[PDB]
Amino acid sequence: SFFSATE
Amino acid sequence: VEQVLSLEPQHELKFRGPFTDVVTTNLKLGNPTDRNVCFKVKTTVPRRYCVRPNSGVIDAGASLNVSVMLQPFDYDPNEKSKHKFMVQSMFAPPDTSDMEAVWKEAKPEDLMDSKLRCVFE
């Protein structure tokens, strides 16, 4: 459900 | 398992309009311990935000300001909640700088999770 945020 | 980092804000990230442009808000992560702490920022809608930095190490005694940039929109209508964030932290092992394998190696009691909700004003 949570994914690594991207920049 | 208790979060050793200080978070400001700790519960709600507030984004003020207009929402036709990017909205940047700050997330300050502070490390009050004598050890370096690794962190990862996750969200339920990664295509809707630009988060810088999104992962890294906060040295003992230091703080870091994470820029959380709400984009005007994305092309992912299948993203469930546009409104949840999570900061995950773990102590950096002594003789280690390849963070990737550390996170994989990690036992659940070694991971500290802090959840935040986004509010659009």
Author numbering:
A (entry chain B): 501 to 507
B (entry chain A): 4 to 124
What does the paper say about this structure?
To answer this question, we solved the crystal structure of mouse VAPB MSP domain bound a phosphorylated FFAT peptide from mMIGA2 (residues 289–298, referred to as mMIGA2pFFAT) at 1.68 Å resolution. The overall structure of the mVAPB-mMIGA2pFFAT complex highly resembles that of VAPA-ORP1 (rmsd of 0.74 Å over 108 Cα) and VAPA-STARD3 (rmsd of 0.81 Å over 112 Cα), which possess a conventional and a single phosphorylated FFAT motif, respectively. Overall, the extended structure of mMIGA2pFFAT peptide binds across the center of mVAPB. The phosphorylated S292 residue forms an ionic bond with the side chain of a conserved K87 residue of mVAPB and also associates with the K118 residue of mVAPB via a water molecule. To test whether these residues are genuinely responsible for mVAPB interactions with mMIGA2pFFAT, we generated mutants (K43L/K45L and K87L/K118L) of mVAPB and measured their dissociation constants using ITC. While wild-type mVAPB showed a dissociation constant (Kd) of 1.7 ± 0.2 μM for mMIGA2pFFAT, the binding affinities of K87L/K118L and K43L/K45L mutants were 3- and 5-fold lower than that of wild type mVAPB, respectively. ITC measurements demonstrated that wild-type mMIGA2275–570 could not interact with mVAPB, whereas the S292E and S295D phosphorylation mimic mutants of mMIGA2275–570 showed binding affinities (Kd) of 26.4 ± 6.8 and 8.1 ± 1.5 μM, respectively. The S292E and S295D double mutations synergistically increased the binding affinity to 2.5 ± 0.3 μM, suggesting that both phosphorylations are needed for association with VAPB. In this study, we showed that phosphorylations at both S292 and S295 of mouse MIGA2 FFAT motif are required for its tight interaction with the VAPB using structural and biochemical analyses. The result suggests that the phosphorylation-induced MIGA2-VAPB interaction enhances the lipid transfer rate when both proteins are tethered.
